[PDB]
Amino acid sequence: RANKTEIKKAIRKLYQVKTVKVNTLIRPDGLKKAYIRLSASYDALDTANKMGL
Amino acid sequence: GRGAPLARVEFRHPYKYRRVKELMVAPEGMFTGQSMLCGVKAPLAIGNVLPL
Amino acid sequence: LLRKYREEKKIDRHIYRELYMKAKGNVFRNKRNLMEHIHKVKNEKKKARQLA
Amino acid sequence: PREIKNLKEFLAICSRKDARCVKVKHNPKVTKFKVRCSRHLYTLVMADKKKADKIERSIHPSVKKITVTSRSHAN
Amino acid sequence: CPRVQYRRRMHYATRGNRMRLVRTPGNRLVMQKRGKRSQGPHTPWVLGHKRLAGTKALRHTKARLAPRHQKTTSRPYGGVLSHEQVRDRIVRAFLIEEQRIVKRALKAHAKVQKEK
């Protein structure tokens, strides 16, 4: 039930990054998936390592 | 669905600043641009509306 | 062909009109047929003018 | 895309502070300066090879300038 | 050899869905939608449906964004009537008013003459 604007603000609060685009889809099993592109000043690989991926 | 042609006549509203459009059954010889007079003091001509 | 001759002034407006209606009337079979008729008409006009 | 006509118009556009970069294209018998501003790409086409260098050296050092070349898939 | 497919999501050939065939720089043949055309400004229908001069035929979005003088002329009743119809109204206004002034004077003078 979340929308794009709420997702973008939640990401910054949780991980302290700035984004440039959010794309969403609803999966066939009912879940919602989001692709989030970070700004060039932020490294997605560095953030994923901090997350624990 | 109707055999008789109809006429669109345009009057002025008696009390307001607007125009009133009416739709009547046309008598023979009626033409576009003709003047229609309706009332007690109207003359006796084809297409005019008078009290009996 | 008739339009070209009128522009070049080898023919005048009187003959052009007469030949225009005869072309529509199925008188001339092809381009050569029209050209021989025009010369025949023009030669007769020369004879009448020289008689005047 | 818009075309610049004379030099004095080009100097004003290149000094608009909105130019991200200036792309220089070296075509045969012509050189083109393509200024990338917001909403529009302004081009200036010069048929004289000389003083086309003069503009290249006299461009503002602050703005970024690139030479357009043919890039490959791996490039 | 090449055959084409609809690229948007309406697959019926109506008057509002008309396509032209275009060859791309990649050597492909695709369908591109061509829009509807307006008929442009006209004179009033009861006065004859005549296309006005000096006005362009623009669709709803283009007409809103266009400059004003593209839809009008700089004369009274600019983008509404034609020059023949403007002349008719001016002559009608002046001549009919003249008859009222003349006939009013005649009625007044005849009454005064009769009373004396």
């Binding site: - | 042609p5 006429a7 023979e28 010889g29 576009t32 | - | - | -």
Partner: protein, 89 residues
């Protein structure tokens, strides 16, 4: 009468519908498609457009007339009666 001896415009019907019904409809068909004199502009330019509606190609006037002819004989009598009764006052 080069193409047809007597059928005229009804030659489009072939050998159907009978000779007398075709003759009765031919008279009204000819006048309905004819060109009638316009009193407003003095031209033979009145043509029918739907039953009882006549439009002039010259002056672009529209008149309410009768079915298959611009003016009916009953209308001519009525105009004279009304004119006399108006003049009677």
């Amino acid at each position: 009468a080069k193409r047809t001896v007597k059928m005229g415009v009804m030659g489009r019907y072939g050998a159907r519908y009978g000779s007398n019904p075709r003759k009765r409809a031919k008279k009204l068909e000819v006048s309905q498609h004819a060109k009638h004199f316009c009193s407003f502009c003095g031209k033979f330019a009145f043509r029918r457009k739907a039953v009882g509606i006549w439009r002039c190609d010259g002056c672009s006037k529209t008149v309410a007339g009768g079915a298959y002819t611009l003016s009916t004989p009953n209308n001519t009598t009525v105009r004279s009666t009304v004119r006399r009764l108006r003049e009677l006052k």
